[PDB]
Design an enzyme around this catalytic site. Structure first.
Site, PDB file in Angstrom:
ATOM      1  N   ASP A  68      49.290   4.095  -7.075  1.00  0.00           N
ATOM      2  CA  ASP A  68      50.629   4.684  -7.078  1.00  0.00           C
ATOM      3  C   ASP A  68      51.618   3.585  -6.727  1.00  0.00           C
ATOM      4  O   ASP A  68      51.224   2.564  -6.105  1.00  0.00           O
ATOM      5  CB  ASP A  68      50.676   5.962  -6.233  1.00  0.00           C
ATOM      6  CG  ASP A  68      50.225   5.879  -4.797  1.00  0.00           C
ATOM      7  OD1 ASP A  68      50.239   4.763  -4.211  1.00  0.00           O
ATOM      8  OD2 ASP A  68      49.930   6.979  -4.195  1.00  0.00           O
ATOM      9  N   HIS A 114      47.611   1.123  -3.871  1.00  0.00           N
ATOM     10  CA  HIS A 114      48.816   1.706  -3.268  1.00  0.00           C
ATOM     11  C   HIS A 114      49.813   0.572  -3.107  1.00  0.00           C
ATOM     12  O   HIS A 114      49.487  -0.451  -2.420  1.00  0.00           O
ATOM     13  CB  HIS A 114      48.510   2.373  -1.948  1.00  0.00           C
ATOM     14  CG  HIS A 114      47.609   3.549  -2.057  1.00  0.00           C
ATOM     15  ND1 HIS A 114      47.994   4.683  -2.760  1.00  0.00           N
ATOM     16  CD2 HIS A 114      46.373   3.809  -1.564  1.00  0.00           C
ATOM     17  CE1 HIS A 114      47.003   5.563  -2.734  1.00  0.00           C
ATOM     18  NE2 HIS A 114      45.977   5.060  -1.971  1.00  0.00           N
ATOM     19  N   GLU A 146      37.988   1.669   3.798  1.00  0.00           N
ATOM     20  CA  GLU A 146      38.995   1.075   4.703  1.00  0.00           C
ATOM     21  C   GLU A 146      38.352   0.628   6.023  1.00  0.00           C
ATOM     22  O   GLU A 146      38.708   1.073   7.105  1.00  0.00           O
ATOM     23  CB  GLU A 146      40.105   2.107   4.926  1.00  0.00           C
ATOM     24  CG  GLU A 146      40.812   2.466   3.668  1.00  0.00           C
ATOM     25  CD  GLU A 146      41.954   3.483   3.842  1.00  0.00           C
ATOM     26  OE1 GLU A 146      42.283   3.827   5.000  1.00  0.00           O
ATOM     27  OE2 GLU A 146      42.496   3.931   2.786  1.00  0.00           O
ATOM     28  N   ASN A 166      35.679   0.738  -0.753  1.00  0.00           N
ATOM     29  CA  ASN A 166      37.054   1.046  -1.229  1.00  0.00           C
ATOM     30  C   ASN A 166      38.076   0.635  -0.169  1.00  0.00           C
ATOM     31  O   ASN A 166      37.873   0.974   1.011  1.00  0.00           O
ATOM     32  CB  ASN A 166      37.090   2.544  -1.549  1.00  0.00           C
ATOM     33  CG  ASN A 166      38.349   2.987  -2.257  1.00  0.00           C
ATOM     34  OD1 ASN A 166      38.665   2.459  -3.335  1.00  0.00           O
ATOM     35  ND2 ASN A 166      39.011   3.991  -1.691  1.00  0.00           N
ATOM     36  N   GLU A 210      43.155   4.372  -6.573  1.00  0.00           N
ATOM     37  CA  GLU A 210      44.166   5.284  -5.983  1.00  0.00           C
ATOM     38  C   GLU A 210      45.604   4.872  -6.327  1.00  0.00           C
ATOM     39  O   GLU A 210      46.469   4.930  -5.480  1.00  0.00           O
ATOM     40  CB  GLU A 210      43.993   5.438  -4.477  1.00  0.00           C
ATOM     41  CG  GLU A 210      42.587   5.649  -4.003  1.00  0.00           C
ATOM     42  CD  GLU A 210      42.445   5.884  -2.514  1.00  0.00           C
ATOM     43  OE1 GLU A 210      41.246   5.914  -2.077  1.00  0.00           O
ATOM     44  OE2 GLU A 210      43.444   6.014  -1.798  1.00  0.00           O
TER      45      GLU A 210
END
Ligand SMILES: *[C@@H]1O[C@H](CO)[C@@H](O)[C@H](O)[C@H]1NC(C)=O
Ligand SMILES: *[C@@H]1O[C@H](CO)[C@@H](O)[C@H](O)[C@H]1NC(C)=O
Ligand SMILES: [K+]
Ligand SMILES: [K+]
Length: 321
Positions: free
Chosen positions: A240, A208, A131, A172, A238
């Site tokens: 979701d 996400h 990030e 990432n 990751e």
């Protein structure tokens, strides 16, 4: 057929999940975390981060990270080691230090050399830099960026490559799936590391999402291909799909379609190597404590019972449900 069995049958290297140390006293939870039909890969959610591994300068603590590594090794699951350099979950000696470029560079390299060396040969991937971008694709300010400048990124990748030449080194980030400015800046970070002569092997797309904001499968393939064109692998790291509570049959069905599109995009794309969900049960999801009013983001509910999204993931990997 489980999720990892479905994934490997379609040429992916794994289907996997994050977990965290506090969850490992929940025996019904660990029983399913250890189900290698579903989970071929594990990510430590927290215990390999800088505050967990170097709580004072030059003092390293690996006990909690090694619990997660040893669980993966015991199950024969791959490990995605996560994460070396990030603005968040830093100890105060880093954020509050009186640094120069030289001294923070040395402390950065020493952190990475110690952590990567400790886990040498255990990590299929490292999330080396996490990030580093603002929503508009400028650099996110953090003490590395203000002290070292953008050089901190290739410095980090070179230090990880030297300590474990066998680990695939990833950048990432979230919101790259939309393309646009942020994805273009992620591709610029890949070219920065190549320009510096440092190793970079992958881009991690966190996935996400809020329900109903996932684009079409073909749109996702196009974005993944924009990264594989640079000679890096990609993975969804990751995933979701958060719902504004309460859930309805409509938002559970949309969540299933959204997960289905994401995993099929990885199946279709040469060089997309795998798919990780950010934990696997709503019981332990980060979403409610992060996205106020949201939840129910994962393929199993808080009672460890499959939701529609479990069958959506299987359908996205070509399995008849
Ligand atoms: C889960 O697997 C790990 C690694 O093999 C093992 O240490 C642990 O005992 C297992 N737990 C359960 C509940 O199966
Ligand atoms: C820090 O040092 C490195 C190595 O010389 C250099 O690439 C980078 O531009 C420097 N950053 C600043 C802010 O001086
Ligand atoms: K693939
Ligand atoms: K958690």
């Amino acid at each position: 057929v489980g999720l990892d069995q479905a994934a490997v049958a379609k040429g992916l290297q794994y289907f996997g999940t994050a977990t965290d140390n506090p969850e490992l006293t929940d025996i019904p939870y660990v029983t399913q975390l250890n189900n290698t039909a579903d989970f071929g890969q594990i990510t430590p959610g927290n215990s390999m981060k800088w505050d967990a591994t170097e709580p004072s300068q030059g003092t390293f603590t690996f006990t909690k990270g090694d619990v997660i590594a040893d669980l993966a090794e015991g199950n024969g699951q791959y490990l995605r080691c996560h994460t070396l350099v990030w603005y968040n979950q830093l100890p105060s000696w880093v954020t509050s230090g009186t640094w120069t470029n030289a001294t923070l560079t040395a402390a950065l390299k020493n952190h990475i050399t110690n952590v990567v060396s400790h886990y040498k040969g255990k990590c299929l991937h490292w999330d080396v830099v996490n990030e580093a971008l603002n929503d508009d694709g400028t650099y996110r300010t953090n003490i590395f960026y203000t002290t070292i400048g953008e050089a901190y990124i290739p410095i980090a990748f070179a230090a990880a490559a030297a300590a474990d030449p066998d680990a695939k080194l990833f950048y990432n980030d979230y919101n790259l799936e939309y393309g646009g400015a942020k994805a273009a800046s992620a591709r610029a970070i890949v070219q920065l590391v190549k320009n510096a002569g440092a190793k970079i092997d992958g881009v991690g797309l966190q996935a996400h999402f809020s329900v109903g904001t996932v684009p079409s499968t073909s749109s996702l393939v196009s974005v993944l291909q924009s990264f594989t064109a640079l000679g890096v692998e990609v993975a969804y790291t990751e995933a979701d799909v958060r719902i504004l509570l309460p859930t309805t049959a409509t938002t559970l069905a949309q969540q299933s379609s959204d997960f289905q599109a994401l995993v099929q995009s990885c199946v279709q794309t040469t060089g997309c190597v795998g798919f990780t969900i950010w934990d696997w049960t709503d019981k332990y999801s980060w979403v409610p404590s992060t996205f106020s009013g949201y939840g129910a983001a994962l393929p199993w509910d808080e009672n460890l019972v499959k939701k529609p999204a479990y069958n959506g993931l299987l359908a996205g990997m070509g399995v008849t449900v």
